[PDB]
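queue> pop job 88
queue> type: inverse folding (structure -> sequence)
queue> payload:
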């Protein structure tokens, strides 16, 4: 809105994709979820210590 600069999104905000770099640990959370690039981005944008275990499926 004229700031003319972009803002790291809430992860919720984007999702209906199949560019899955699935499995992302959290370091504090320590559990194996499944994600979009827009998700991974958003996660990395602000916060830190995301580990990519697998490009493609998790531990299921």
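queue> result:
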């Amino acid at each position: 809105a004229s700031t003319s600069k972009c803002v790291c999104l809430l992860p919720p905000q984007c999702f209906k994709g199949g560019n899955q770099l699935y499995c992302v640990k959290m370091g504090s959370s320590t559990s194996e979820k499944t994600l979009n690039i827009c998700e991974v981005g958003t996660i990395r944008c602000a916060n830190r210590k995301m580990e990519i275990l697998h490009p493609g499926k998790c531990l299921a």
